[PDB]
Amino acid sequence: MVYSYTEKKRIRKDFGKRPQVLDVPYLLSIQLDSFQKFIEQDPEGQYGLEAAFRSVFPIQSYSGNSELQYVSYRLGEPVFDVQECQIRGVTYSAPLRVKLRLVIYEREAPEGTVKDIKEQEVYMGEIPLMTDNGTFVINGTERVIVSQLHRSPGVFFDSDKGKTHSSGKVLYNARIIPYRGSWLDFEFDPKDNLFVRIDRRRKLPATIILRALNYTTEQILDLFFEKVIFEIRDNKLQMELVPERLRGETASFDIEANGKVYVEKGRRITARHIRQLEKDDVKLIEVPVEYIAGKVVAKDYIDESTGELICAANMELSLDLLAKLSQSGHKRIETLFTNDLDHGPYISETLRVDPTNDRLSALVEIYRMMRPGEPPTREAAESLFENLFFSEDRYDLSAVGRMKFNRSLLREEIEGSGILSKDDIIDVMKKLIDIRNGKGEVDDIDHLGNRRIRSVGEMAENQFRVGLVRVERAVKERLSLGDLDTLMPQDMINAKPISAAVKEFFGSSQLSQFMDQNNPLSEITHKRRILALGPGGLTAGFEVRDVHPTHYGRVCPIETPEGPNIGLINSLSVYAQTNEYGFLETPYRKVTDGVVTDEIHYLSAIEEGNYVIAQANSNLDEEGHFVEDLVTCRSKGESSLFSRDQVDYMDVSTQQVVSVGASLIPFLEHDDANRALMGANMQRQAVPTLRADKPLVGTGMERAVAVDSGVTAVAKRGGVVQYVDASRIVIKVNEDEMYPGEAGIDIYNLTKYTRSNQNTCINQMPCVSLGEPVERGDVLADGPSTDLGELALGQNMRVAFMPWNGYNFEDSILVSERVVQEDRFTTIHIQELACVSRDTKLGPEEITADIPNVGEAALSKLDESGIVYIGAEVTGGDILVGKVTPKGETQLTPEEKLLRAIFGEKASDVKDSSLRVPNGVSGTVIDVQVFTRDGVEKDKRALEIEEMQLKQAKKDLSEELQILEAGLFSRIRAVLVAGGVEAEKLDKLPRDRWLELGLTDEEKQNQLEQLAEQYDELKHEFEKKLEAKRRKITQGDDLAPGVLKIVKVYLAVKRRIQPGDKMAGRHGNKGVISKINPIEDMPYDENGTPVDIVLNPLGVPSRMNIGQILETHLGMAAKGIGDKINAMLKQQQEVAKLREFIQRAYDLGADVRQKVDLSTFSDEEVMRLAENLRKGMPIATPVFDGAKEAEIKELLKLGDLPTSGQIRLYDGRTGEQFERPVTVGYMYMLKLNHLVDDKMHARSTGSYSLVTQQPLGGKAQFGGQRFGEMEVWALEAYGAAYTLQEMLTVKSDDVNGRTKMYKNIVDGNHQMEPGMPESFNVLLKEIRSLGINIELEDE
């Protein structure tokens, strides 16, 4: 708040105007928040383990009045901690202990229990735990669960116009989608017949479900249709007329009452005629006996005398039928109100296609639909249909389902029952008919109000629920036969069944995946990710991939993969949040009257719909009145100019449209969206470097990405640094931030060189120095690819745009040797290689160091036990772990046998299985771990390690206690000196004896007490932490069946940079370093300074990304401000001269949001800042709020450098000039990890597959390249027959020709005696194994 302590070290000069009202929230919100609701104690039905329990519980037996209910649940402390869980390889998890209650009701009650045994916390399963950074450790490997996006449950009405039947006419269908349970589909057809289908199953006439709800034809007709009353009064047929019935119809006869003819025959009744009837209140008219020939009678009508049915309900009356129901004494006849435009006569004709009659009939016809071919049964059909949509067990919409359902049905209640009601289905049918009638619209799936966001917590809740249903069958099953007091709620509820539902998700699921950890941006951008397909959903359709108007501020427009799934991923936006109900909402600013108010307001996708939202980029001042009389705004799905005082809200930030990825691209507004996608897409691939650099050109998010992702080490509490080691950092907490008891100091243990998921190096460095004040929320130590708390994914360098003798040809990059000499793009890789000693039927394999047919030079690098020493530098082929496996009676041959007689060698009974270093990769062994089966005797090396780990543990634990004790006694010293101060007196006697001295009556005596209590706890907690650690060490690690022991060697390879490596800027510019050029031949400027990289200018115009050029220019300028300081610092001008110029930099001409110094202390503080600025002056280009040409050229003026951004350069070869200026500057460049010595493979003769003999890599010497169909055509188009035969015969599939060929290649005869490929030879046996006789004819 006016600048922090690690902010005092380096300040980034920030262009841009718009004040930031809201700051990037926690970027990990979604991932962390979700799992927090799942595992939690919620004193109610809110989603969580509590809620999932209350669903399946209590489980009661069948009538047996033996019930097993659920009390409460708890999470025990984890079995191993995160670090240990990772080393050993098991999952980081907590035991779930749930208190259960077994009640048995007396048989033939009044209900009362003979006995209820309460089983104390029966253990069911171990549910996994989430890291403080939101990853899970499944087996020793960090994993993220991606959030999923699906269609929210409720009711949804779609169209399906066009393609169906090609007659036009559209169609209208309704769909009820519950969170769990069967789907209910309603749909029309070309004849305007309403249909229903359960799941995707057979279509059934809609009315048939209503019958299953116990609705007779009369009440179904009575539900969906209005009543036309026909009166026989005096004689021949009167009728009631609602003056509104005549709209949209042409008069069919003389309509007359009250001695006045309102409408004549053939004149349609428009609003005028209707007005006359309405205002004249004409209730009853006289109608002809011929008008009812088409009108459908409503209820049943029988002849009172013969007691026989004259006409059944839903039958068309005729002029003759009126006679037969008129002479029976009927005054009134009810008919349907049917209008082909407003209220359609659909259901009436739907009944005519209905094969069923009564409820049992419909239930029969439904059950035979779901499970056909087998005879339906009454108890079965009734049970099934009641179990589909109406049972709390097999169906739930939950709250969101019920809420969106009721909300879309235009109801009041926003929360309700989790099942369907007769009212609900009838109401849904009513809504579908209303849309077909022209009133109402269909929703669209792509809108984010119908698109809901899941995440790990919700998924696990569902999975744990599944464990509970499959244990449920068991609980009832046992409670079926149970003896009274013998069994308890333990013998019944199992573990494996419940535990295995959750374990299968995190273990193998499309949503649990290796964290993309090559990179801090990689981590944080993976943890924020969306899916639109995956497991639960549609695993053509381009509509959903495309960008939607609701994506603004919710989903990133430009960060999505370019490929098979485009728009199928997205990423979460910068300020986006999971809605209370699970939608996606974005921040906004409330505009009351004419002022832009700083109250923030979160609007969901549908909430935002009706409001008018101003633009993030708008001009206001003073009181915050919109400067212009009209401002660009967007209201409902579209944007246009809006009046001064109209706007309800305004964008929070200029950023909120994009994502954390896109927000890191400087001058983004200047890059074409295709290359921008590619840019934000490639930035996650930057492998970290040896020297963490820092971006010279930036946005200002780099701090948030570094800190919010856990790669770094952040100060818990402020204080002064007591101790700084490359290992740990110990902070003496300030008293204002400190708790009363135990005092304290925060001991931060730094991560050291270690393997990332992608086999990159993740290593932390201390960024503060001994005894320096640090404030809460300050960066304590940098992580990989972070600088002084900011995010550096690569290293900026001097770049020149110009063709260099074609070495930059396509995207190829020409890099000076200076880059590789400076070791700046170097990368450290950590590979985990393993050696397993298994069990075979011939015998166990030994890890012994005695290996057949290897020299003393081979076995040198191994110890007595057979494992390579720590620190031994190794190369390709070197032996990491000696291993030998039994193979008996080799059965050699005559000439081999003579060979052994001459050279007198005893051929061993053991085969060489030793793990040896992969070919070509060379590094230093930085570690060895040895896991041994529990019960096999630990070997020498393994034993040394155990002792080593034991001693190392003790120093660490004691170290904790040692610093802790001094920190506590140092506080006792201060409290004892107030009120009883003895300065020299107190510190003479042994420190341990201080605790006796009490104090005068005061709270300080109670403070001394506190520190006492916490002291002794620490004394003992240390004891217990040490004991547990020791046991975890000595316990034999559990291994697989058959595995006696496993040795993991950890190699640290340092790869630098070479032709073939991938490099890219933030702007979507790829490249492959082509040649590495001497510093002598590099283009240089008049000053004699070479240039690091020569990029091709030709890549810029075609791909329109101009930011890369601004990024270059400003970069050059930034470097300018640095160089200038480097001169004033190398001149040691003074604090005064430097202070002036630096203030000059931070202002830069007008109207920026930066502010700045001369508050900073002119001596110790000012000089340190300039020293950190001397490399270049760090600059901030906000995303859409970013710098401008004028600001950039002006910074170049302060630079002493031309505005052009171009200089004179000289070819280092001829020493002669270059015609024209070339643009030189500093472009930030990432090294992606595609590095050529991963990708490169070659094979001569490798191993081969058993099923079909074909090249297959078994040594990781990769199987040969795959020759495809298209590649075959290419040989056929050329005339090359023999190249093709040798490709698909001798080189691959021919078990003979390969060997017959190989002997000739060395023999010096190039030929092939191809024979028949084993592929076809197999097809022959396969066809012939069928009843097909396939022979090869003739000769």
Partner 1 sequence: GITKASLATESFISAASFQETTRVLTEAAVAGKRDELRGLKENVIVGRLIPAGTGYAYHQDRMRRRAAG
Partner 2 sequence: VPLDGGRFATSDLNDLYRRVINRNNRLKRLLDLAAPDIIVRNEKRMLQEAVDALLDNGRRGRAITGSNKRPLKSLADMIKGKQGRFRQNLLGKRVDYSGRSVITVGPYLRLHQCGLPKKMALELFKPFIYGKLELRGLATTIKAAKKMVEREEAVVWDILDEVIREHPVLLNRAPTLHRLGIQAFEPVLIEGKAIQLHPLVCAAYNADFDGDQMAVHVPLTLEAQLEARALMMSTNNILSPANGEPIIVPSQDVVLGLYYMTRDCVNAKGEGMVLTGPKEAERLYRSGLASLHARVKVRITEYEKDANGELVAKTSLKDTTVGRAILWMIVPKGLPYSIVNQALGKKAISKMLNTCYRILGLKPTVIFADQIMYTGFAYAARSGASVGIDDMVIPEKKHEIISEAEAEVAEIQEQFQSGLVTAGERYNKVIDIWAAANDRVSKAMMDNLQTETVINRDGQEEKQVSFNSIYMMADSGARGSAAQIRQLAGMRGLMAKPDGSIIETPITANFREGLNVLQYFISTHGARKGLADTALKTANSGYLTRRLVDVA
Which spans of this chain sit near partner 1 (rule: CB under 8 A)? 1272, 1275-1276, 1278-1282, 1284-1285, 1288-1289, 1293-1294, 1314-1317, 1319-1320, 1327, 1332-1334, 1337-1338
Q: Which residues pair with 930 in a beta bridge?
A: 1047
In 3D, which of 694, 695, 701 has the Cα closest to residue 660?
701
> Is 1268 an interacting residue with respect to partner 2 (CB under 8 A)?
yes
> Is 514 an interacting residue with respect to ligand KNG (CB under 6 A)?
yes
Residue 1337 touches which member of partner 2, partner 1, ligand KNG, none, C-beta under 5-8 Å by kind: partner 1
The contacts of residue 490 (CB under 8 Å, 6+ apart) are 119, 122
Buried b (16+ CB within 10 A) or exposed e, 997-1024: eebeeeebeebbebbeebbeebeeebee
Instruction: Decide: helix, strand or coil at residue 766.
Output: strand
Report how far residue 421's alpha carbon sits from residue 389's, in angstroms, rounded to the nearest whole number.
9
In the 8-state DSSP scheme, what is residue 306? T
What's the min distance (Å) between Cβ of 950 and ligand KNG? 35
> Is 277 an interacting residue with respect to ligand KNG (CB under 6 A)?
no
Please, which residue, 587 or 1317, has the CB nearer to partner 1? 1317
What's the min distance (Å) between Cβ of 785 and ligand KNG? 15
Please, which residue, 565 or 1058, has the CB nearer to ligand KNG? 565
What's the min distance (Å) between Cβ of 1321 and partner 2? 10
Q: Which residues pair with 208 in a beta bridge?
A: none
Among 25, 534, 886, 1246, binds ligand KNG (CB under 6 A): 534
> Is 291 an interacting residue with respect to ligand KNG (CB under 6 A)?
no
> Is 166 an interacting residue with respect to ligand KNG (CB under 6 A)?
no
Residue 1237 touches which member of ligand KNG, partner 1, partner 2, none, C-beta under 5-8 Å by kind: partner 2
What's the min distance (Å) between Cβ of 539 and partner 1? 25
Question: What are the backbone dihedrals phi and psi of residue 805, each rounded to the nearest 5 degrees, phi first?
Answer: 40, 35
Among 309, 1239, 1299, 1334, binds partner 2 (CB under 8 A): 1239
Candidate segments 59-67, 439-447, 504-512, 1103-1111, binder of ligand KNG by CB under 6 A = 504-512
CA dihedral 639, 644, 648, 654 (to 10 degrees): 60
> Is 513 an interacting residue with respect to ligand KNG (CB under 6 A)?
yes
> Is 734 an interacting residue with respect to ligand KNG (CB under 6 A)?
no
Q: Apex CA 1233: angle with CA 1228 and CA 1236, to 5°?
A: 110
The Cα diameter of the chain in Å comes to 138
Among 305, 508, 640, 1214, binds ligand KNG (CB under 6 A): 508
Q: What is the CB-side half-sphere exposure of residue 187 using CA atoms within 13 A?
A: 22
Output the CA–CA distances (angstroms, integers) from residue 721 to 25, 152, 767, in the order listed: 29, 52, 12
Do 1063 and 1072 meet the contact criterion of CB atoms below 8 Å apart?
yes
In 3D, which of 745, 785, 746 has the Cα closest to residue 764?
785
Both tokens assigned to 614: 């101003």
Do 890 and 878 meet the contact criterion of CB atoms below 8 Å apart?
no
Q: Which residues pair with 840 in a beta bridge?
A: 843
Q: List strand residue ranges (DSSP E) for 635-727, in order.
A: 639-643, 649-651, 697-698, 713-714, 719-724
Residue 516 touches which member of partner 1, partner 2, ligand KNG, none, C-beta under 5-8 Å by kind: ligand KNG
What's the min distance (Å) between Cβ of 454 and ligand KNG? 12
Q: List strand residue ranges (DSSP E) for 944-997, in order.
A: none
In the 8-state DSSP scheme, what is residue 372? T
The contacts of residue 906 (CB under 8 Å, 6+ apart) are none
> Is 674 an interacting residue with respect to partner 2 (CB under 8 A)?
yes
Report how far residue 371's alpha carbon sits from residue 369's, in angstroms, rounded to the nearest whole number.
6
The contacts of residue 155 (CB under 8 Å, 6+ apart) are 174, 175, 176, 177, 404, 405, 408, 409, 428, 431
> Is 530 an interacting residue with respect to partner 2 (CB under 8 A)?
no
Please, which residue, 561 or 773, has the CB nearer to ligand KNG? 561
Residue 545 touches which member of partner 1, ligand KNG, partner 2, none, C-beta under 5-8 Å by kind: partner 2
> Is 1119 an interacting residue with respect to partner 2 (CB under 8 A)?
no
> Is 1116 an interacting residue with respect to partner 2 (CB under 8 A)?
no
Residue 615 touches which member of partner 1, ligand KNG, partner 2, none, C-beta under 5-8 Å by kind: partner 2
Please, which residue, 1252 or 1319, has the CB nearer to partner 1? 1319
The contacts of residue 686 (CB under 8 Å, 6+ apart) are 518, 519, 521, 785, 793, 794, 1230, 1231, 1232, 1233
By CB under 6 A, the count of residues binding ligand KNG is: 14
> Is 634 an interacting residue with respect to partner 2 (CB under 8 A)?
yes
Do 646 and 654 meet the contact criterion of CB atoms below 8 Å apart?
no
Candidate segments 508-516, 613-621, 902-910, 994-1002, binder of partner 2 by CB under 8 A = 613-621
Report how far residue 946's alpha carbon sits from residue 929's, in angstroms, rounded to the nearest whole number.
10
Among 354, 516, 608, 782, binds ligand KNG (CB under 6 A): 516
What's the min distance (Å) between Cβ of 1321 and partner 1? 9
Residue 750 touches which member of partner 2, ligand KNG, partner 1, none, C-beta under 5-8 Å by kind: none
> Is 1320 an interacting residue with respect to partner 2 (CB under 8 A)?
yes
Among 381, 531, 915, 1094, binds ligand KNG (CB under 6 A): 531
Report how far residue 330's alpha carbon sits from residue 307's, in angstroms, rounded to the nearest whole number.
13
Do 1315 and 1289 meet the contact criterion of CB atoms below 8 Å apart?
yes
Both tokens assigned to 304: 């009172």
Rg (CA), the chain: 40
Residue 1149 touches which member of partner 1, ligand KNG, partner 2, none, C-beta under 5-8 Å by kind: none
> Is 561 an interacting residue with respect to ligand KNG (CB under 6 A)?
yes
**Bond from prior residue into 58 cis (ω within 30 degrees of 0):** yes
Among 569, 676, 696, 814, binds ligand KNG (CB under 6 A): 569
What's the min distance (Å) between Cβ of 1060 and partner 2? 4
CB count within 10 Å of CB 188 equals 24
Report how far residue 666's alpha carbon sits from residue 390's, in angstroms, rounded to the nearest whole number.
56
Instruction: Decide: helix, strand or coil at residue 136.
Output: strand
Please, which residue, 474 or 1316, has the CB nearer to partner 1? 1316
Give helix 456-481 / helix 29-38 axis angle, nearest 10°.
20
Q: Which residues pair with 297 in a beta bridge?
A: 335
Do 696 and 1226 meet the contact criterion of CB atoms below 8 Å apart?
yes
> Is 140 an interacting residue with respect to ligand KNG (CB under 6 A)?
no
Residue 373 touches which member of partner 2, partner 1, ligand KNG, none, C-beta under 5-8 Å by kind: none
In the 8-state DSSP scheme, what is residue 455? -
Per-residue binding letters, 1070-1109, with partner 2 (x by CB under 8 A): xxxxxx--------------------xxxxxxx-x-x--x
Per-residue binding letters, 795-814, with partner 2 (x by CB under 8 A): -----xxxxxxxxxxxxx--
Please, which residue, 371 or 430, has the CB nearer to partner 2? 371
Per-residue binding letters, 343-362, with partner 2 (x by CB under 8 A): --------------------
Residue 1333 touches which member of partner 1, ligand KNG, partner 2, none, C-beta under 5-8 Å by kind: partner 1
What's the min distance (Å) between Cβ of 834 and ligand KNG? 18
Please, which residue, 760 or 1074, has the CB nearer to ligand KNG? 760
Phi/psi region, residue 954 (left: phi>0; alpha: psi -120 to 50; beta: rest), is alpha
Per-residue binding letters, 690-719, with partner 2 (x by CB under 8 A): ------------------------------
> Is 509 an interacting residue with respect to ligand KNG (CB under 6 A)?
yes
Residue 672 touches which member of partner 1, ligand KNG, partner 2, none, C-beta under 5-8 Å by kind: partner 2
Binding site for ligand KNG (CB under 6 A): 146, 508-514, 516, 526, 531, 534, 561, 569
